[PDB]
Design a protein around this ligand. Structure first.
Ligand code: MG
Ligand code: ZN
Ligand code: ZN
Lengths: 378, 59, 95, 189
DNA sequence: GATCTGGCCTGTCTTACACAGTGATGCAAATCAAGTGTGAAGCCAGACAAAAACCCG
DNA sequence: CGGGTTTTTGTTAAGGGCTGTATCACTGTGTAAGACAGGCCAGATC
DNA sequence: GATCTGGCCTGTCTTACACAGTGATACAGCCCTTAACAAAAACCCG
DNA sequence: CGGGTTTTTGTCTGGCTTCACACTTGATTTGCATCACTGTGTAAGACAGGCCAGATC
C-alpha cells in the first residue's frame, strides 16, 4: 500500500485504542520479520570453495562500487550504486519459494524426504529507467538516468530415476512481480566505463558459481541445487552494445547471424544461428592482432562487424510486438506501392507517393473509420 | 523455438514510475541511504511470500 | 493516512480474507459515512426569511463564480472556484 | 493581487454574511429546537491583504498604522499617545469624499485629508498583530541601537558607511567569540 | 533658456532560513515466561414466599 | 459384488437486499521513430 | 589543379501514442421462502 | 376508590466452575523521545529603471 512509518504507527495506535485489543503489529516485530526475510539471514554452503568469493553469510546491501577508489587523484565518478550478493539473493529467493516448490513436489506424486540435485533455470535482465529526478527547485536541472540489474527464477526441475519432472514452472515470467533485483546504479546506459566497472563483480561471481553446488536447509533436510543461467532479458540495443558489436549503422545488423543487410535482402530464408560468444572473442582477438596485415575495410569485413571486447555472455531472443510491427510496416509499404500501379511507372516522385498515401489514409478513414498516423505502433 | 519453446510477450513505465514512487514516498536524503532503502523496498515488493499472502482472497 | 480508494479496498479485502471476519467496512458504507457529514444534509430553518438566499437545504459543493459571464464577448477570466454555502457550512459545523 | 476576480468571487459570501449578521438559526440537533445567533470577526487577515481589501495603499503610503491616522513623520515623534480612529463606515465616508471632492482642493491636500484612502472598502475587517512581528521589530531596532552605541556616533556627527560596516563586523566577531552566536542579515524569530 | 546630475519610489529578483518529512536508534517502563497455593467470586439442582404497576367491579 | 437403509446436496420458480469487480470520463506522463541539421566526402567545372 | 556541389551517414530532437491513476457509476454475482422430485456418498447383510 | 393479576424479587442447602494475587526476576516488547540529513515555501533585502527637482554656460 506504500505506507510510511509515522502514519502506520498512527493508524496502529488508533485501531488499538478503538477496538481495545491489539490486532495489528507495531514496527518492532515488523522490522524483525523484515530483517528475517531479507537476504543474508539463513546459512548455506557450497561444495566447491567458490574462489574469489568470501564465505561470510550475514551481509546484505553493499556499495556497488566494489571498493573503487574515488579520491581526488583518480578517475572522477559520483554515481551511487548499491548491490546485493548474487548467492545471497539467490538463496533468499530459493528460501521464500521453498513453500511453493514443496507444494509442487507434494502435488507431483513425490514424497518430502527427497534430495537433489535440483536444477534451477535463472534468467538475468537489466534496463534503464530514464528520468528519475523530480527536480522542482528551478525546473529541468539534469537528465539523471538510472539502471537496475535483476534476475528471475522461472523453472525448477528434479531428475529422479530415469526421467525428470518440472516441480516448478512460472505461470507468467514476463511480469513486474517476480523481477528479483540485484543492483541499482545512478548511471547512464551509454556510460560504458561505469557500467562495466559496476557489472564486473556480478559477472565474476556468476562465472564462479556457474560450476558449483549449493547446499541449503529447507525443512530440516539438506538439499543440493545446481543453476543454469540465461541472459535473455536484454533489448537489441543493449545486446548489440555489450556483445562488442557496432551501432545501428553499417550493413551488419543481425544479432543471431553474421549476414548483412544486402545478403538478407537477396536471400531471406538462408541463415541460421551462428553468433556464439567464443566466436566473438576470437573475432575480437583477430581484430586486435590483425595477423594478415590487410586494409581497414578488409579486416572489418573479415571480423564481420564486431569491433569491441564483449564481457557478458547473452542468449538473444525476439519480441512478439516487434516481429509483428516489422511485418505490418512492410505490408503498409507494399499496399502504398500497389495502390499506385508502380509496375507501370518507371520513375517515382515524392509528390506521387504523398498523394497516394493521402488517398489511402482518406479511404481508410472513410471506410474503416480510424485515425491514420505516421507514428507506427502495435 | 527449438531453443526455448516460447517467444514470449515481454515488454515501459513499470520500471520508472514504481522507482520514483518508492523514492518519493519512503526514502531518505543524502543520496547514500536513499538507494539502500529503495532497493530494500523493491526487494520486499517482489517476494512470493508476501504476494501469496496478498492474493489469498481468490480461494 | 492519505489512503486512496483502490489501496483501501485492497487492504480491506486482504484483511477480510486473512481473518475471515469483516472487521473493516466496504466502500459504500464509507461513502454514506462521508455524505452524512458533508454540508447540506441535516435540515434547519431561519426565523427571518433571509432575502436573496434560497431556501433549498440539500446543496453542497457549488461553483464559486455564482453564475459567471464566461461568454466570449465578456471580460476574460480563467479561474476554478468551488465553494460551500455559508449557512450550510455553519449547520454542518454545528452538527 | 488580482482585485477584480477576488471581488467577484467574494461578493456572494460577503452578502450572505451581512444578511446572516441579523438572523436567527433554528436547528434540531439535540432532539429539541435550539436557536443560534452569530457574531463575525474578520481578524485572520495579514497586513498585505488588510492594506488592500480595506482601501488603503499597499506599501507606498506615509500612513503606516492600520488603526490610527498618524503619518510616518509624526509617528517618530509621538510614540505611545495614540488611539484607534479607523472603522469601516468612516472609510466609506472618506472614499466618498475622495470621489466627490466637494471642497475643490489640490491633489496633495485631498490625499492627506482622506488619510491615504483611494479604494472603496467592501469587507469590514478587524486588524490584529502577533508577538513574532513585535519581537523581531524590537530586536531589529536594538541591533542598530547597539551598532550606534558601539560606534561612538554621539561624538561623531557624520560618519561613513564603511566605518559603520567595520563597526558591524567588529560587533559580529565579538558576539560570535563571547556569546557564540551566528549573525545574519536574514532575520527571523 | 537648454540640458546635466544626485536623491528617493517602487516593482524586481535573490537568497537565507526554519520546518517537515523519510528512515533508524535507544533507554524508561509495563508485561510476561513457568512454579504451585489458596481464595474470593460467578453460576446451578432441591421447593417455598416479597415490592410495584395497570385494569376491573 | 450388489441392493437396502440412511445421510447429505440441487432445482427452479423473484423481487429484494447485500457485496465484488469492471468501466468511464478525466487528465497526466514515459517513450521509440523518423526527421533533420550537419559531417564527410567524390564528382563536375573554370 | 583548386573550388563548388549532390548524395550517403550520423548524432541529436521533437513528438504523438500507448498507457497510468482516480472518484463515481453501473453491472454482476450470492441468500430468502415451499417442495416434490432429481442427484452424490458411507455402511451393512445377502 | 379498593381489590385482583402479572411481573419481577428473592430465598437457604448443598453443589459445580472460574479468575486473581502472591511473590518469584530478569527477559521481552512496548512506547515516546531523540538522531542523520536534505528540499522547499516564505519573508527579509538590496537594486536598478524611472521620476523627479536643483543647477551652470
Ligand atoms: Mg532498453
Ligand atoms: Zn539474422
Ligand atoms: Zn498607530
Amino acid at each position: 500500500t506504500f505506507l510510511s512509518c509515522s502514519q502506520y504507527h498512527k493508524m496502529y495506535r488508533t485501531v488499538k485504542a478503538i477496538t481495545g485489543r491489539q490486532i495489528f503489529q507495531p514496527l518492532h516485530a515488523l522490522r524483525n520479520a523484515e530483517k528475517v526475510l531479507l537476504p543474508g539471514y539463513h546459512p548455506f554452503e557450497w561444495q566447491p570453495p567458490l574462489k574469489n568469493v568470501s564465505s561470510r553469510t550475514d551481509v546484505g546491501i553493499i556499495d556497488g562500487l566494489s571498493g573503487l577508489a574515488s579520491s581526488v587523484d583518480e578517475y572522477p565518478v559520483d554515481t551511487i550504486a548499491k548491490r546485493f550478493r548474487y548467492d545471497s539473493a539467490l538463496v533468499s529467493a530459493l528460501m521464500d519459494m521453498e513453500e511453493d516448490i514443496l507444494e509442487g513436489m507434494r502435488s507431483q506424486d513425490l514424497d518430502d524426504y527427497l534430495n537433489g540435485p535440483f536444477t534451477v533455470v535463472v534468467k538475468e535482465s537489466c534496463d534503464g529507467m530514464g528520468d528519475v529526478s523530480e527536480k522542482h527547485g528551478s525546473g529541468p536541472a539534469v537528465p539523471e538516468k538510472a539502471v537496475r540489474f535483476s534476475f528471475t527464477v522461472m523453472r525448477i526441475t528434479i531428475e529422479h530415476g530415469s526421467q525428470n519432472v518440472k516441480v516448478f514452472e512460472e505461470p507468467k515470467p514476463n511480469s513486474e512481480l517476480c523481477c528479483k533485483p540485484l543492483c541499482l546504479m545512478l548511471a547512464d546506459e551509454s556510460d560504458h566505463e561505469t557500467l562495466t566497472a559496476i557489472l564486473s563483480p556480478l559477472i565474476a561471481e556468476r562465472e564462479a558459481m556457474k560450476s558449483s553446488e549449493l547446499t541449503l536447509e529447507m525443512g530440516g533436510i539438506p538439499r543440493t541445487f545446481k543453476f543454469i543461467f540465461r541472459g535473455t532479458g536484454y533489448d537489441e540495443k543493449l545486446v548489440r552494445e555489450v556483445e562488442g558489436l557496432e551501432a545501428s549503422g553499417s550493413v551488419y545488423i543481425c544479432t543471431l547471424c553474421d549476414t548483412t543487410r544486402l545478403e538478407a535482402s537477396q536471400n531471406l530464408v538462408f541463415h541460421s544461428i551462428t553468433r556464439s560468444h567464443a566466436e566473438n572473442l576470437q573475432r575480437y582477438e583477430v581484430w586486435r592482432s590483425n595477423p594478415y596485415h590487410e586494409s581497414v575495410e578488409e579486416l572489418r569485413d573479415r571480423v564481420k562487424g564486431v569491433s569491441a571486447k564483449p564481457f557478458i555472455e547473452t542468449v538473444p531472443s525476439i519480441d512478439a510486438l516487434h516481429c509483428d510491427i516489422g511485418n505490418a510496416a512492410e505490408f503498409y509499404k507494399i499496399f502504398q506501392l500497389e495502390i499506385g500501379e508502380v509496375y507501370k511507372h518507371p520513375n517515382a516522385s515524392k509528390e506521387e507517393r504523398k498523394r497516394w498515401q493521402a488517398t489511402l489514409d482518406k479511404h481508410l478513414r472513410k471506410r474503416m473509420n480510424l485515425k491514420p498516423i505516421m507514428r507506427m505502433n502495435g | 523455438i527449438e531453443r526455448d519453446g516460447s517467444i514470449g510477450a515481454w515488454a515501459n513505465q513499470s520500471g520508472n514510475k514504481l522507482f520514483r514512487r518508492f523514492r518519493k514516498m519512503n526514502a531518505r536524503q543524502s543520496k547514500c541511504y536513499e538507494m539502500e532503502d529503495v532497493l530494500k523496498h523493491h526487494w520486499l515488493y517482489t517476494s512470493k511470500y508476501l504476494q501469496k499472502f496478498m492474493n489469498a482472497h481468490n480461494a
